[PDB]
Amino acid sequence: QYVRIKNWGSGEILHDTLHHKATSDSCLGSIMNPKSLTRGPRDKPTPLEELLPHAIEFINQYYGSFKEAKIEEHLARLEAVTKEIETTGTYQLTLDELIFATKMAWRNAPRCIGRIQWSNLQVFDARNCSTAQEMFQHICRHILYATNNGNIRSAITVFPQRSDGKHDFRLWNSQLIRYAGYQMPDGTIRGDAATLEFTQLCIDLGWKPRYGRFDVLPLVLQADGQDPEVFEIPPDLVLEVTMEHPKYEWFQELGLKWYALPAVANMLLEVGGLEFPACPFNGWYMGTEIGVRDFCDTQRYNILEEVGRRMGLETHTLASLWKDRAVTEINVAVLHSFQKQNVTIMDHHTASESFMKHMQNEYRARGGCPADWIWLVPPVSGSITPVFHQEMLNYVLSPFYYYQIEPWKTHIWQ
């Protein structure tokens, strides 16, 4: 009938009617959460006719991977998996296949720029987990390992796969560590304005609002389909970096800081027909994420206004290019602060150059590399980065990390 378009800045929604008047051969590339990048809920297990081909294809991919194929084992695995499928409905991946799966799903993540690190990933097997308290412990082990007191390590914690569709393990958080956002009495908003609706959710589940700008949100976990249990993350585990500019000593007076761990929590890993709706992963930060996005977005911390004021820029004249001046410094603050406090971080320039190297390796190796230009090009210095001048193809392969419908929208409350 029509297409819904949203402006993530003002949150304003629009309805596109015009596209109907279009010619022959509409691209939706600009859309944030398209259904094509989302893998939703279920009620019944994966139909056998669908699971089997996917499984067989995955197993052929895995065995067709190493240097000198173990054909007998390949044939044996195919056979054992087929049997296991017709015997239980679903099947279990060996640890080595899961390891391969996670790396490949990352390797196939069109929106990730750090993919040159794809072969360096720690896999935490939490497939035997069965309770919320148990998830929480697995998560803590993850946060601890990943953090490594600054020298961040890429890692992923794979929880139990989806069975019938009503026994899903899900983390209700955007990411492991994430500040809270509250709409204060005086009309304002303190903290991360992006976690507003979620923060309220934690409040309704009995969370203690510490009303601040950097209040690490609680872990909201759901095990085997039972309602979510609220667990607070042990502060000793949550490593942070206090922002401070190497020149403007008044920068630390802003009282800015940010967590060192970028651990996406709400994504689903699909592989060989199977699907893990809970499998938080992490790599390390890239400056612009915090410096530009987190700190400067209108819908986020929105620090630009005063960072410019304190630099003495013509804040009421757009053409003065003050925003470009401010942000650049905020970015250096971040890179410096992290680099100083010995926390692994990467600037967008070096990141872009390493990705270009990755694309080359990828095309020569498997003849391609799924890439989402819109996401790969840094939020600043677009054409200054090599990836801006690189034409790219965006496609979904398998394994793959899909998005999923926010759990609170689709959940039964016992």
Added chain:
Amino acid sequence: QYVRIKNWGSGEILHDTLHHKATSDSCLGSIMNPKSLTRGPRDKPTPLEELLPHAIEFINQYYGSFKEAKIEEHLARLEAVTKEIETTGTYQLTLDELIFATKMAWRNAPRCIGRIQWSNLQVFDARNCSTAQEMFQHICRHILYATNNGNIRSAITVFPQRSDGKHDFRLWNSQLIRYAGYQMPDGTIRGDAATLEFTQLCIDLGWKPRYGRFDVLPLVLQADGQDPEVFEIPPDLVLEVTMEHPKYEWFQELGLKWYALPAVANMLLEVGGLEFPACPFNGWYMGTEIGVRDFCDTQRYNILEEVGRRMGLETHTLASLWKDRAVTEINVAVLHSFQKQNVTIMDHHTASESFMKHMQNEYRARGGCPADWIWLVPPVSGSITPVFHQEMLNYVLSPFYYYQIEPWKTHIWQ
């Protein structure tokens, strides 16, 4: 069989084989010149069965435009056009329809950010033109009018429409004014490295290589299918802006300048089935085009290296964010230089804010707005601009300005 991908920086070409292994519902949005945005050559006129519906649809669009429809004239025009079509094959647009066409084709240009100015466009009717010398004169009138000694004016010069497909009026230039590029003896390259192949083309047609960094290229015009005649543009017409930073007085020592007129020359206007393969248009510049793209692209002037050196930045350490510092200043140089020499220019921030206003007007007015995010988002300060957080739909409507196959690749030489 496979998809060709090019890196416009290194000019390197790659072949994507992987996309075949993709799932259900591949976006090519990242591609520069897709066939979907190109309208090629022909040998025979537009088949009547195709022309008539398009014509009728266009005429219904035009008459359905004004406030209180002139139904009788609407019906009369439909009738007269139909008759004229079955009588001559093709048909002629009234001046008022052409005016409407050009504005609408601009209005439907998914890659243009200045579209809020769509209703302010001067239309030059050169449809009666028949010789190269005549084109040249029409072009000069355009350049003169558009320039207006700094106070730039949006304008378009429409030349004779395509008839049989072998009597095309074409400008072989990328744009009206455009510097030359030569590959000097010492391995280097002087001027605009983007116009290399074209500059050589002018040289072969007897052009006098003035071997410099800012040598305005000749107008290569082809009338009614006769080979291209080379005409040099009168220097009095070519207005330029010498670059100079408001603080770094050593900036003017770079000897930088750029033309004030952004007049795209090689595009085709399609409307009501008809198509004008020659219809150069112009609006005014937006800083980042010159400051970031023209001056800093690796494939262009590539000034970044020394602009950074002269600012005393750590040119051998990427993470120092020197490139972000340099470019910002180059951008202010441009904005200042233009603003100082009273030449109309627009910074990307104000441009982005006016476009957002445009989108709103557009959606409320016709229920949509074809937008290409990849092109609309400035080459710098991505997320700092409102358009970065705006989800958008990219589609081709009619009328429309299509790209066309480079004329030298498809031309008969008598």
